[PDB]
Amino acid sequence: SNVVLVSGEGERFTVDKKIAERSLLLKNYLNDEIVMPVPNVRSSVLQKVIEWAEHHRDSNFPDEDDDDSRKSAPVDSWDREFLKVDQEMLYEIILAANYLNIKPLLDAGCKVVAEMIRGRSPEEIRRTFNIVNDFTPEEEAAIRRENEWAE
Amino acid sequence: MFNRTTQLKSKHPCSVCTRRKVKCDRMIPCGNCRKRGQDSECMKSTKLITASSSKEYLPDLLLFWQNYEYWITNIGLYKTKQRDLTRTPANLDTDTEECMFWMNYLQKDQSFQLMNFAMENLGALYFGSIGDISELYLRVEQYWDRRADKNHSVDGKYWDALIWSVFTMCIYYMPVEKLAEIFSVYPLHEYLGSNKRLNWEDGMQLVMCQNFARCSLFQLKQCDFMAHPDIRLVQAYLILATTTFPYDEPLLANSLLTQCIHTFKNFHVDDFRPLLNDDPVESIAKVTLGRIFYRLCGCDYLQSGPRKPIALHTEVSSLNVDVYREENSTEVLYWKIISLDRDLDQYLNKSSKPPLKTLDAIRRELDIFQYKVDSLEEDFRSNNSRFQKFIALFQISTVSWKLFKMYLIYYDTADSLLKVIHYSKVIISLIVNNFHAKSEFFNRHPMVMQTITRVVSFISFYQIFVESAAVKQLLVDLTELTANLPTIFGSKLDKLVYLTERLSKLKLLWDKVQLLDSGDSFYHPVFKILQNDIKIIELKNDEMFSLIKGLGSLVPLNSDFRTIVEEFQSEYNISDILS
């Protein structure tokens, strides 16, 4: 009832098989101690994943095709605080949940990413406006003249 | 092959493209602005891309690898039986001495010891085809009374050829030890005059399998099936399609499949649900005919190609279907896991990329097969149980791996290369665990043949350009398992070994020739030779040369990268593996 996670760092994490069921890649590998490669994700991100599996291994989870329990699913405030982390390493959390097919953790992190992206100030959106290519500068001048009376 | 196709295609055009007044090759920076020497002039808008060392030939290269691995690894290696009509000497009957030797060589213990071995071993295949084996044991018993008769009833001739197809399938999964213990190695090589030192894996096990197929034919030719259509023709053709025969012979099996589909559509029977006023006889007939027709669609799909003019599958597993989903998921599970891959393959030859929404819907229903095969029963000792279990496990893993291959090729989603590496090793480890007794003939269905056909193609092909660590570790087990495939495949096995060799020498060909920049048009022999050989096999598929002989005795009339290209064209030639 235990499998072994051998990451790109190769830190062998012998976790429970019920932990392994959430990773649907690894739950498929159960049909294939019980080692498997994760050649990209570091094992601290994996340890975050495992601790989430410790927390919500017993939790109940939606049909993952919903709207109400998919898009308007409320977050875990515990896993809000648990994922109040690096912006960068949060993307590695995202890539880990992608790479191991861990969908409710992917959505749970995803919604917190959606929190952090929204609500940003129009000050910086005015500022961080054409960081990427995004517009011809003629249109950039036209936008700045479009609000010219106040901007 | 070659275009620009680099990383981070930008959003808005620069001034140089507006001067340029053509299509916006909105790369970093352009293939056209670099062609005008104004590379940096198209760079100077905002966020000047990144390193100019991302291998920009590689996406074009994988787009043409789609062209290859469609038109070679199914079509070019298997589906071109380019033979002749003049250079093939005639055979008028020629089985009154040949198939009658199998009338001679067949023994009753040699029948029933195959029959009883294949009972729990293969008890899903014929159970998917016909059901009961004891009626078939009864037909082998009456067959020694139905052996050399005079009142050869047409129906009874179908029953006679039925067990030749059954014997074909029994050869197709029996290991060679029990084969030499039940049969005799030598009287075949006596009758052929060939070598006595030919334990059956050395070439003649599958030949005797094809001889049992041929003795099914020799009685089916006497059945007059073109004037006598019936379902057992299609059932035994399912049983023969389980063998390597559709790959070793595409064209004959195409016409036999054509007659089987005409046979089915003679009945004009579509729905498989026992309604209110239905006969229970007709009820069970429809229930059987369901799995019959979906296995028939599976046979339609595996031979599908340019030599397949008449199609059968007209339904979609997602999103003008005929009888789709009004059917109990028992062995149409075996069809639906194939039709899953079917809808993938209307985007292999065509470079039009499918919507990724569809591919992720496919990613959703992938796990439905993954945990509906877990929704079955389980028997450790009934070999058909773990047999069908490993078949469906292999099929969902195969379509999964090919799907992540498609993800990397068409759009390059996150970590999909490592998904390819992972599912490749999982499938190969499943083969390794079935290197055992009772499970060596889990490794004999042509699904593993066509799966390794893709794996040793693309892993070697990505080893060509990216000398990666995991691709090298997988390439070691590739070269090991390529030799360690079962002998039930035979000629295409050796063609696959030559294909592995030619792709390794194609890697060496990339190693010896630097890729020539010509603005953004890149040049290598790897480009042009693979441009040419696919078109060679298409010109073989352009069957005018087999019809130029049909319209009379008519005879028609039709640099650095010209030399080493045309040195590798015959150095490691494709003509070894056309046939």
Added chain:
Amino acid sequence: HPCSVCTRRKVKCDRMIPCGNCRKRGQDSECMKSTITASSSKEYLPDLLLFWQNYEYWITNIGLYKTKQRDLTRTPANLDTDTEECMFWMNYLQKDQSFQLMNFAMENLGALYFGSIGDISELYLRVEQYWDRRADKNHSVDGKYWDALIWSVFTMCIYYMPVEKLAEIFSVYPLHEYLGSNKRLNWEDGMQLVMCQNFARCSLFQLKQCDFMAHPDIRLVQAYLILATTTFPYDEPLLANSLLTQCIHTFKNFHVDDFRPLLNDDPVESIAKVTLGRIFYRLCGCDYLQSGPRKPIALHTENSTEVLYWKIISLDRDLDQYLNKSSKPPLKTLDAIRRELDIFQYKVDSLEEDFRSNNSRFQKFIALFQISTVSWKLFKMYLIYYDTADSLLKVIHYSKVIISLIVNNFHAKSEFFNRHPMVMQTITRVVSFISFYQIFVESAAVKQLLVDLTELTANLPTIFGSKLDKLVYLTERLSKLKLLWDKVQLLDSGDSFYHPVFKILQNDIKIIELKNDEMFSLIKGLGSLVPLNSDFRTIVEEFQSEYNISDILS
């Protein structure tokens, strides 16, 4: 007819249900008084005749010629007479018995080999070399393809050749030694057809000496489109649909798309696009004229005279997509047949023919009978469907135009014009519909046309053989269905007319389509799973048992 309240309250000529201005005024069940108890007015003349279409496909076209019965557990295999049906008749047919047959098609049948292979003298290269190839014993697959190609034309040249040439070229007496039949005959009494089928089976076993399905060629389709010129697609419909399906598989394996030449091609290829579009047009003809449930797989996919053949047969494609249908063909659609009748009628009437150039005469006569059958069946589908006046005029008219196409072609080097299956089906439809109309709306000119075609069918020889006789019975029983109508008062429940004729016209289609039900043949394929399946009461049992409708299965 306008209904009751249309005649009572005097409203518009309204065959609505019940009316569009009487149901609204509170008279729904009061205005359904429009059409066991009895009735004998012409209310059936709208109420019935469309049921005839159900008869017209499934009994005349399917039931009389195409519906085929076998016996799987009793019929011997081909292990009995493996080569001897092929070898004895290959050893009997000599150089006179090859080329003297071939000179019938060389003089008389110019559109056929141009429709299939192009030239007959190009075929004479192979047939002359066949006497350097009959002696060959280790052929190639190509040479056997040529063998089965020319033995198909050897088959075809048997049938259409009259009996006077045929008794001279072929001797009667050594050949009945093989089968065991009567030597006393001359060939036309269902024996010229039998030796035709014997040579057909010779070419088919040469195809089994080919085993063509391994690597097929255009010799397959060029031989099948020659074999299909006779009633062999009606003598063996199960076999012919199978070989036609093999022609579909083979011809489309060669990836034939364009039918007009292109400039960037091989001239062999660009000329072969027309030189196989002719094969495609005859392939479409065999795809169309074998319209049956036993033929499920279709090929619709959509010089100056071979495409013109498939033009009028595609005008026929606008005709017989309503036989099984209860759908009315629209009057605009039935005029779209008629405005293309205007296209291809005078083009037929501009076709050149010379009584020595019988090649050109049969060249004419194919389209000359196709456009006339278009005329007759077009105004017949006016007449049965819409009950259009001046169409029984056109039925009796174009029936006698076909009488002119037949009676003036029994003569010297013209009787093989009366040996094609198109007249065999068309006169079948004439003697069907005229007998049926004489059952129900009894007129004397229709019975006179019945006597006309009775005399013509007696003039029609027994070269058609066993498929003739069932047609003979078609002339009998239907007229007795007239006598079945004349003896019983027509009954109903007030509107829905009931008759012994009506009950028997049901079981005509029901039992013959039950013979077309191959389900329990598939349960025979399941093997051990056993396949199990007033005057209106008793004279039905009389006329069904006496005039036994299952007698057309031989």
